[PDB]
Amino acid sequence: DATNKKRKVFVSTILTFWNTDRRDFPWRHTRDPYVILITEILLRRTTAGHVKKIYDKFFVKYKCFEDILKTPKSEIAKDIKEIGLSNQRAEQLKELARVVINDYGGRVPRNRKAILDLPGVGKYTCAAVMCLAFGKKAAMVDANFVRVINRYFGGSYENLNYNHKALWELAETLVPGGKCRDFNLGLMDFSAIICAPRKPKCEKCGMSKLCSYYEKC
Ligand code: SF4
Ligand SMILES: [Cl-]
Ligand SMILES: [Cl-]
Ligand SMILES: [Zn+2]
**Helices and strands (DSSP H and E) totals, the chain:** 12, 0
202 assigned binding-site residue: yes
Question: Is residue 176 within 8 Å of 15, Cβ to Cβ?
Answer: yes
Rounded Cα gap, residues 112 and 125, in angstroms = 11
CA distances from 74 to 14, 68, 80, 211, 212 (A): 42, 12, 10, 50, 50
Angle separating helix axes 180-193 and 3-20, nearest 10 degrees: 80
Rounded Cα gap, residues 152 and 167, in angstroms = 13
205 assigned binding-site residue: yes
217 assigned binding-site residue: no
Among 169, 164, 132, 148, CA closest to 212: 148
CA atoms within 13 A on the CB side of 128: 23
The resolution in angstroms reads 2.0
Rounded Cα gap, residues 194 and 48, in angstroms = 18
210 CB under 6 A from ligand 1?
no
Residue of 194, 203, 215, 216 to mutate, ligand 1, most atoms within 8 A of C-beta? 194
Domain with CATH 1.10.340.30 in the chain: 24-136
CA distances from 173 to 15, 29, 95, 177, 206 (A): 15, 26, 34, 10, 21
Residue 64 Cα to ligand 4 midpoint, Å, equals: 5
User: What backbone phi and psi angles, to 5 degrees, belong to 207?
Assistant: -120, 20
Q: Class of 1-23+137-217 per CATH? A: mainly alpha
Question: Of how many residues is the chain composed?
Answer: 217
- Separation of first and last alpha carbons in the chain: 25
208 CB under 6 A from ligand 1?
yes
Residue 45 Cα to ligand 1 midpoint, Å, equals: 26
Fold for 24-136, please state it: Endonuclease III; domain 1 (1.10.340)
Instruction: Give the distance from CA 171 to its chain's centroid.
Output: 13
212 CB under 6 A from ligand 1?
no
Angle separating helix axes 48-61 and 33-42, nearest 10 degrees: 140
Domain with CATH 1.10.1670.10 in the chain: 1-23+137-217
